[PDB]
From a paper:
Cytoplasmic polyhedrosis viruses (CPVs), like other members of the order Reovirales, produce viroplasms, hubs of viral assembly that shield them from host immunity. Our study investigates the potential role of NSP9, a nucleic acid-binding non-structural protein encoded by CPVs, in viroplasm biogenesis. NSP9 robustly binds to single- and double-stranded nucleic acids, regardless of RNA or DNA origin.
Accordingly, we expressed a truncated NSP9 (NSP9ΔC, lacking residues 287–320) from BmCPV1 in E. coli as an N-terminally MBP-tagged protein. The purified NSP9ΔC existed as a dimer in solution, as confirmed by SEC and analytical ultracentrifugation (AUC), with a precise molar mass of 60.5 kDa. In the asymmetric unit, four molecules of NSP9ΔC were identified and organized into two virtually identical dimers, with a Root Mean Square Deviation (RMSD) of 0.6 Å. The final refined model achieved a high resolution of 1.80 Å, exhibiting favorable stereochemistry parameters and refinement statistics (Rwork = 0.18 and Rfree = 0.20). The overall structure of the NSP9ΔC subunit revealed a compact architecture composed of 8 α-helices (α1 to α8) and 13 β-strands (β1 to β13). The NSP9ΔC homodimer exhibits a distinctive awninged ship-like structure. The dimerization interaction of NSP9ΔC involves an interface area of approximately 1536 Å2 (11.5% of the total solvent-accessible surface per protomer) between protomers A and B, and approximately 1177 Å2 (9.6% of the total solvent-accessible surface per protomer) between protomers C and D due to the lack of the awning-like β-sheet II pairs, both larger than the homodimer interaction of MRCV P9-1 according to the PDBePISA server. The arch-shaped structure contains six positively charged amino acids, specifically R9, K10, K12, K20, K23 and R28, which span residues 8 to 28 and form the tunnel. The elucidated structure identified a positively charged tunnel surrounded by a compact NSP9ΔC dimer as the nucleic acid binding channel, thereby suggesting a plausible interaction potentially between the protein and the nucleic acid from both termini.
Numbering used by the authors:
A (entry chain B): -2 to 82, 111 to 284
B (entry chain A): 0 to 84, 111 to 284
The structure:
């Protein structure tokens, strides 16, 4: 699929139902999707990725989180904030049962590059499709601006945080991607034709970008000694466009790979 | 004083679920106080300039036209009719039981001016509060950006259409108000800190604003003759920012005054 149809999937099982005075509203027919993310998850689950093989046991849920040094696959214990069915992970108890670090050179940069290329392609494809005065297919247009977008926002947030961990100061992500990190959810019509920022934020961002990210350890267990390793650094807070408040990432923007 | 534009979210009109978890309803909703004030004054016959003369035995609505403000009582077959719980109006049957035109000079401009001043005040306040580096209370910030906004978007749509009917060509509304007319609704976080448009749209709008509106008759009955009067012109379509598709106003952006 090309153009905007590369970023649309059929909304087979609606992940959103809206209710109003006894009526259940009709679910959107489609959802926004970043195909490179779907492909990555599939390859990791099936052990068919060309550069990275998850070695953790698949009898427990596996998550992944970006750190400054690469990509961490991890199995949270039931007490970890990332666990899917108590003090936050700290230097004495990480609440991580096991982990696997993949450094940039060993495949994490290849993964990030594939994700980033797709995300930037989406941003550019939105300009070509919605902002260039070009004739548009009516059905495709309405599929786009009514599409479910919650999963897509989470995919783009994951790509953003990888870009920041790898290269916040040297290859900063564009504001069109940063916005996913400081707004939990953006509706598809705003993604396609609007923004979670305005023009002043655009000029500001080139100047502010080195100051928008706070990092903190992604705690994991020491293998031969008690306590936690503290040297793996994840995104902890992202400064919002008002430059006063932050969006907090309790688990560094981690996402689930398999259950 | 963003709190001037907030009301308690007493009886939310919708509830939303994500993957079967109901989201917490917002504590507050955005509101345009000049709109609430206007409706109350029209209902209670305490408006300083305009008195509705239609019978209150039936529901009363109002709609902007190029020559002012039309109060009307729709019949059950009219698209604006609201029940306790079919062909569109045309030059033969308006489905309007009675109407009252108030010209700009006889009070409609005063009404529009009070609404417009409030809406422009909101737009300017959003800049002062969210884009000026001003210290803000964290709780108040989150109350604003999580607020429900559907009713507010409808209020802003009404002000916008009045601005267009009165002075599309001579005093065009700003894009910060036009956006409410080409989006079904905008969430509060996007209203406060983002937009339903992007930077290129600002320059497009400066050039296009005299060409974005299609008008059509608001059909009302001829009083001495069969059929409908066809010379009262309401907003029928507003061109979206992509410049291809339009938002349709089946009843010219009419709103209910009294039930």
């Amino acid at each position: 699929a090309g153009f905007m149809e590369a970023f649309l999937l059929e909304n087979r099982k609606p992940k959103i139902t809206t209710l109003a005075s006894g009526k259940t509203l009709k679910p959107a027919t489609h959802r926004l999707n970043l195909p490179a993310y779907t492909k990555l998850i599939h390859e990791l689950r099936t052990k068919t990725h060309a550069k990275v093989t998850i070695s953790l046991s698949t009898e427990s849920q596996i998550h992944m989180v970006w750190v400054k040094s690469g990509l961490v696959f991890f199995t949270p214990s039931a007490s970890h904030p990332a666990y899917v069915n108590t003090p936050l992970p700290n230097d004495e108890a990480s609440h991580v049962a096991s982990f696997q670090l993949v450094t940039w050179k060993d495949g994490a940069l290849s993964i990030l590059n594939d994700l980033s290329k797709c995300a930037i392609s989406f941003i550019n494809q939105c300009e070509d499709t919605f902002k260039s005065g070009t004739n548009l297919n009516k059905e495709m247009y309405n599929r786009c601006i009514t599409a479910e977008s919650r999963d897509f926002c989470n995919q783009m947030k994951f790509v953003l945080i990888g870009r920041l961990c790898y290269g916040q100061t040297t290859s900063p992500p564009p504001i069109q991607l940063y916005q996913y990190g400081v707004t939990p959810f953006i509706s598809a019509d705003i993604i396609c034709e609007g923004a979670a920022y305005r023009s002043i934020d655009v000029e500001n961002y080139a100047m502010n970008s080195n100051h928008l990210v706070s990092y903190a350890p992604f705690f994991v267990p020491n293998d031969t000694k008690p306590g936690s390793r503290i040297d793996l650094l994840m995104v902890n807070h992202l400064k919002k466009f008002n430059l006063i408040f932050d969006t907090w990432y309790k688990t560094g923007g981690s996402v689930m790979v398999s259950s």
